[PDB]
Amino acid sequence: GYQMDIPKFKRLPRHIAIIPDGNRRWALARGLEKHEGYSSGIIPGLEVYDICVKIGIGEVTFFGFTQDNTKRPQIQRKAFTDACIKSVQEIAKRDAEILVVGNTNSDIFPEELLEYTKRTKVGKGKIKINFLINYGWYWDLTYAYDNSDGKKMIENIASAEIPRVDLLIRWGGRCRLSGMLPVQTVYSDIYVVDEMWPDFKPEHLFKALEFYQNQDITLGG
Amino acid sequence: PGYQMDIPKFKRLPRHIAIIPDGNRRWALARGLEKHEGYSSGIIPGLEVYDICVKIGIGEVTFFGFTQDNTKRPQIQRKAFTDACIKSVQEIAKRDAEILVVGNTNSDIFPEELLEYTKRTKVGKGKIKINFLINYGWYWDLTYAYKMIENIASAEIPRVDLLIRWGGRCRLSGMLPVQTVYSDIYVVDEMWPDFKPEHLFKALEFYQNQD
Ligand SMILES: CC(C)=CCC/C(C)=C/CC/C(C)=C/COC(CO)CO
Ligand SMILES: CC(C)=CCC/C(C)=C/CC/C(C)=C/COC(CO)CO
Secondary structure: OOOOOOOOOOOOOOEEEEEOOOHHHHHHHOOOOHHHHHHHOHHHHHHHHHHHHHHOOOEEEEEEEEOHHHHOOHHHHHHHHHHHHHHHHHHOOOOEEEEEEOOOOOOOOOHHHHHHOOOEEEOOOOOEEEEEEEEOHHHHHHHHHHHOOOHHHHHOOOOOOOOOOOEEEEOOOOOOOOOOOOOOOOOOEEEEOOOOHHHOOHHHHHHHHHHHHOOOOOOOO | OOOOOOOOOOOOOOOEEEEEOOOHHHHHHHOOOOHHHHHHHHHHHHHHHHHHHHHHOOOEEEEEEEEOHHHHOOHHHHHHHHHHHHHHHHHHHOOOEEEEEEOOOOOOOOOHHHHHHOOOEEEOOOOOEEEEEEEEOHHHHHHOOOOHHHHOOOOOOOOOOEEEEOOOOOOOOOOOOOOOOOOEEEEOOOOHHHOOHHHHHHHHHHHHOOO
16 A cells, blocks of 8 residues: 554454445535545545554454445445445455355345355455445344244354454444444444544544553453 | 533434443442442432433433343352342332333342333333343343344334443443444443433433434
């Protein structure tokens, strides 16, 4: 990417979840149409990827779009779907183990991303990058209720390949999960960046990691 | 002008508030008390939240009491938080509420005293729903189903609009994963025993400012 001066951390999360929210508000603030902000959301994700590789984060899960999101106008659906496709394809030009998780039994799931629905090594690998594409919390839990029993259910949710989230970072100033991986996020420390996702700065992630290293982790204990 | 600051008028209210009354052990340690001594100082704060919610007309409040995960803690701490949870429900039972306790009753950790409240119980004039999670667990809740999603253990408890957590941590600690998927979360840095009405007022200001 480009040269940064990255702070030293005493403790790092194994698995970060990213909610790249605020693209529509960012676009409206600059006098663009709501849907135009998604096309300015790709380079921020590449900056997150570059920082995580440099500091040695093992796994990053990006919130792409949910089944709930596909209720929005067509022009928005096309914009966020196009940006999700480009994002996965950009990580595919780099060093990663890519996994896409979402409901592939839908016309809404992009054909371009089917190849990534089993973990796929690109370049040298050595960081796990997950994308939630046509994901839904309800679809995720009900996958287990249908296809499992009892103790087995939890192990058989749709997102079962994605492990517990240590740190969840959300851009766009809202403090809410928007149904991201309810099972993996029961204990996650949540950090909210007030700036919209397209206004990403390395300091956003540095401040989130400073927050994480200051937390007492009990995982329900 | 009066003893207490007046309860503000809010332009938007949540239908359902979740409360995580965290920080009791850190509060106790900071005062030079033993870890388990914080819990008994967390009961009056709950009654203050109850009183304020009745005054503004909040429809439903769910209090995080203790989880199955929490019963991994030392016996002296388990007895302290269990005793304080029992007292809390009994104090609401002397007032005006529709009380529901949700939790795994199939345990010698679940207090016999609260079995009568595992079906929704109208006390006094009712007019507010008060829920307590007692020996609750997210894993127990989701697996209880064994349509299935609508038959989770906590099915009677609706979507949480606003979740307020004391003790400065921004995390759910497995509180109602299904009901909290879209919840707005407000964190109070002060430990729960240091509850002030302004904590709840600022949380409600936060909620009414959301889009
Ligand atoms: C690693 C890389 C390269 C990109 C990762 C970030 C990403 C998926 C950017 C695509 C833009 C996008 C649809 C963000 C999703 O925002 C959601 C919440 O607000 C839905 O509207
Ligand atoms: C409505 C009323 C009156 C009281 C409700 C609050 C209550 C049950 C107090 C009881 C003691 C207490 C605070 C327990 C909470 O501790 C948990 C959080 O950290 C442990 O996991």
